[PDB]
Design an enzyme around this catalytic site. Sequence first.
Site, mmCIF file in Angstrom:
data_model
loop_
_atom_site.group_PDB
_atom_site.id
_atom_site.type_symbol
_atom_site.label_atom_id
_atom_site.label_comp_id
_atom_site.label_asym_id
_atom_site.label_seq_id
_atom_site.Cartn_x
_atom_site.Cartn_y
_atom_site.Cartn_z
ATOM 1 N N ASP A 95 1.690 2.395 5.504
ATOM 2 C CA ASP A 95 1.900 1.870 6.860
ATOM 3 C C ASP A 95 1.279 0.492 7.092
ATOM 4 O O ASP A 95 1.161 0.033 8.229
ATOM 5 C CB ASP A 95 1.340 2.855 7.884
ATOM 6 C CG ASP A 95 -0.167 3.031 7.762
ATOM 7 O OD1 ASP A 95 -0.747 2.572 6.753
ATOM 8 O OD2 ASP A 95 -0.775 3.631 8.672
ATOM 9 N N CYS A 96 0.888 -0.169 6.017
ATOM 10 C CA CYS A 96 0.217 -1.462 6.141
ATOM 11 C C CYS A 96 1.138 -2.512 6.811
ATOM 12 O O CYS A 96 2.186 -2.842 6.286
ATOM 13 C CB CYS A 96 -0.167 -1.886 4.730
ATOM 14 S SG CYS A 96 -1.184 -3.333 4.626
ATOM 15 N N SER A 152 -0.358 -12.495 4.066
ATOM 16 C CA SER A 152 1.055 -12.399 4.464
ATOM 17 C C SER A 152 1.581 -13.654 5.205
ATOM 18 O O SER A 152 2.787 -13.910 5.203
ATOM 19 C CB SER A 152 1.287 -11.146 5.324
ATOM 20 O OG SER A 152 0.645 -11.260 6.587
ATOM 21 N N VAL A 199 -4.234 -6.307 -0.847
ATOM 22 C CA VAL A 199 -2.852 -5.890 -0.708
ATOM 23 C C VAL A 199 -2.406 -6.363 0.680
ATOM 24 O O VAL A 199 -3.159 -6.200 1.644
ATOM 25 C CB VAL A 199 -2.706 -4.337 -0.816
ATOM 26 C CG1 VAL A 199 -1.277 -3.940 -0.777
ATOM 27 C CG2 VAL A 199 -3.359 -3.809 -2.102
ATOM 28 N N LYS A 259 -6.940 2.356 -7.418
ATOM 29 C CA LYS A 259 -6.174 1.191 -7.867
ATOM 30 C C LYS A 259 -6.091 1.181 -9.375
ATOM 31 O O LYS A 259 -7.069 1.462 -10.039
ATOM 32 C CB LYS A 259 -6.810 -0.101 -7.360
ATOM 33 C CG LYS A 259 -6.874 -0.162 -5.820
ATOM 34 C CD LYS A 259 -7.521 -1.432 -5.330
ATOM 35 C CE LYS A 259 -8.035 -1.253 -3.879
ATOM 36 N NZ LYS A 259 -9.302 -0.459 -3.863
ATOM 37 N N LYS A 314 -10.118 6.658 11.737
ATOM 38 C CA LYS A 314 -10.598 5.487 12.464
ATOM 39 C C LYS A 314 -10.790 5.795 13.948
ATOM 40 O O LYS A 314 -11.526 5.096 14.649
ATOM 41 C CB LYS A 314 -9.630 4.313 12.291
ATOM 42 C CG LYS A 314 -9.485 3.824 10.858
ATOM 43 C CD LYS A 314 -8.427 2.722 10.747
ATOM 44 C CE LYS A 314 -8.268 2.245 9.311
ATOM 45 N NZ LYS A 314 -7.149 1.266 9.152
ATOM 46 N N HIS A 374 2.993 0.477 15.107
ATOM 47 C CA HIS A 374 1.677 1.146 15.139
ATOM 48 C C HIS A 374 1.250 1.462 16.563
ATOM 49 O O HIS A 374 0.800 2.564 16.862
ATOM 50 C CB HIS A 374 0.598 0.282 14.488
ATOM 51 C CG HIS A 374 0.573 0.381 13.000
ATOM 52 N ND1 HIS A 374 -0.366 1.128 12.323
ATOM 53 C CD2 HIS A 374 1.382 -0.159 12.060
ATOM 54 C CE1 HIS A 374 -0.133 1.041 11.026
ATOM 55 N NE2 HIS A 374 0.923 0.273 10.840
ATOM 56 N N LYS A 409 0.810 -1.216 0.000
ATOM 57 C CA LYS A 409 0.000 0.000 0.000
ATOM 58 C C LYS A 409 0.844 1.267 0.000
ATOM 59 O O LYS A 409 1.844 1.346 0.705
ATOM 60 C CB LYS A 409 -0.931 0.016 1.210
ATOM 61 C CG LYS A 409 -2.005 -1.041 1.176
ATOM 62 C CD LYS A 409 -3.054 -0.760 2.255
ATOM 63 C CE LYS A 409 -4.115 -1.834 2.272
ATOM 64 N NZ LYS A 409 -4.927 -1.763 3.521
ATOM 65 N N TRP A 424 -4.509 6.490 10.836
ATOM 66 C CA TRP A 424 -5.364 6.191 11.982
ATOM 67 C C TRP A 424 -6.387 7.277 12.315
ATOM 68 O O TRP A 424 -7.385 7.002 12.984
ATOM 69 C CB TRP A 424 -4.517 5.917 13.223
ATOM 70 C CG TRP A 424 -3.973 4.532 13.251
ATOM 71 C CD1 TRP A 424 -2.662 4.154 13.122
ATOM 72 C CD2 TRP A 424 -4.732 3.323 13.388
ATOM 73 N NE1 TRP A 424 -2.565 2.783 13.194
ATOM 74 C CE2 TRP A 424 -3.816 2.254 13.358
ATOM 75 C CE3 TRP A 424 -6.095 3.049 13.547
ATOM 76 C CZ2 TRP A 424 -4.226 0.919 13.468
ATOM 77 C CZ3 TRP A 424 -6.497 1.728 13.661
ATOM 78 C CH2 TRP A 424 -5.564 0.681 13.613
#
EC number: 2.5.1.18
Length: 211
Positions: A19-20, A74, A60, A47, A210, A160, A8, A207
């Site tokens: 920051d993924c 992952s 992703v 995208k 959220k 994070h 990302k 963040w």
Amino acid sequence: MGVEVCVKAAVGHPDTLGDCPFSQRVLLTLEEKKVPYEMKLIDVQNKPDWFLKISPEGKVPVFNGGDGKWIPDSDVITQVIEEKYPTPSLVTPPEYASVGSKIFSCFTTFLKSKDPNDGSEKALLTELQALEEHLKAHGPFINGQNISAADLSLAPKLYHLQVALEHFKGWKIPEDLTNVHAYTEALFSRESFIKTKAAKEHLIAGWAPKV
Ligand SMILES: [Ca+2]
Ligand SMILES: [Ca+2]
């Protein structure tokens, strides 16, 4: 063929790494194993079609190991990389697989909490304390002297935690958790981590809605 990975981009910054933490786990794995790779940054709010063709759900990270396919997840990706590039070995013993496994979710709940006495802080602290005891007994990494997959999964999530909790709540991991502090200071200062982490302002921006 050549190894490629889609990760990302930072929100609003299409040519800057985002920051993924699952993406970062993959990048850390490739970096530590010294595998040459090409990184493709995906603006997840815009995208490109070539990406939608190989990642139809928009997922992703996705990884191309040179074998004519793009794979998600992952967990799966880092296992494929382990199998294809065995040295250095990043295999974590099964009995240490779940070490710190609830830290990220507890962090997200405490971060999003707008009630000081709802108990989310206590839960987060409990998971951090478990990490502390494990590191005391089996440190300095999750599997002793050699870095391994569990470290590369956990480090982005702890990054994070530290940055977002300090920023939004002025909260820091207690100082008496000395092994956790040694752990995060060690991991975050690795060349691989510095190379693959997001700028803090981007992580914080990510963040912000959220919270
Ligand atoms: Ca940019
Ligand atoms: Ca920074």
